Design a protein around this ligand. Structure first.
Ligand SMILES: CCc1oc2ccccc2c1C(=O)c1cc(Br)c(O)c(Br)c1
Ligand SMILES: CCc1oc2ccccc2c1C(=O)c1cc(Br)c(O)c(Br)c1
Ligand SMILES: [Ca+2]
Lengths: 115, 115
């Protein structure tokens, strides 16, 4: 699992379940092409997005549909979504966890990059 | 001042000075039209991006160039930028402060909306 995404809810103190997201890779045309997608599990985690062979260096964007998450709960959000844009670099072995912590008017994201 | 952006550095405990950012507005054809741009001052704040008449209803994106900020300090950060996308003024004019707190592998954004 070269890339995993985990989403947490700071209002309810729980995993953010059934959160949809799409992952894009930047194309030579400087356009965003779909690469992978899914919805978070009951643990708030989305595994199996890609494979080691498929996850090459480049610029990736994870677009998390936070607005639909807050709407299903009845809570009025600020953001249309949460975009996380980063460069994947293949110098030495690296596995990536992208995490997002969600509030209606705030979000935090961090990367946990391990060998 | 209907839209202000404040950026802080969580490594140094200081305002994030001279941080560039670009604001875009979603056009009718679903493309991002340039709206305004600027750099944070010595207080980490960017004022004067727009006016009440220019800042109409719509979907806006703030793209903060955190990568150039970190690289100028000798740090290789994870993210290409910190983006904030939100609907503005849908229930009438509001004043928006967009704040971002920056670390090399993490950022947070929040919005303070007043009427
Ligand atoms: C931006 C997402 C985020 O917000 C936080 C606030 C306090 C502490 C950790 C985090 C955090 C994480 O990165 C995080 C990452 C992993 Br992996 C976890 O298993 C758990 Br749990 C939390
Ligand atoms: C994501 C930006 C952010 O991160 C935080 C972490 C702890 C406390 C406040 C913040 C915070 C702010 O919103 C913030 C907003 C204003 Br306005 C400020 O003048 C100051 Br200073 C900080
Ligand atoms: Ca790789």
């Amino acid at each position: 699992c070269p890339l995993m995404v985990k989403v947490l809810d700071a209002v309810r103190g729980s995993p953010a379940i059934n959160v949809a997201m799409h992952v894009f890779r930047k194309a030579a045309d400087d356009t965003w092409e779909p690469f992978a997608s899914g919805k978070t599990s009951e643990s708030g985690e989305l595994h199996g997005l890609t494979t080691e062979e498929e996850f090459v260096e480049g610029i990736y964007k994870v677009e998390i549909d936070t607005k639909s998450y807050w709407k299903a709960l009845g809570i009025s959000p600020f953001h249309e979504h949460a975009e996380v844009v980063f460069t994947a670099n293949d110098s030495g072995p690296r596995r990536y966890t992208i995490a997002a912590l969600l509030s209606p008017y705030s979000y935090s994201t961090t990367a946990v990059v391990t060998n």
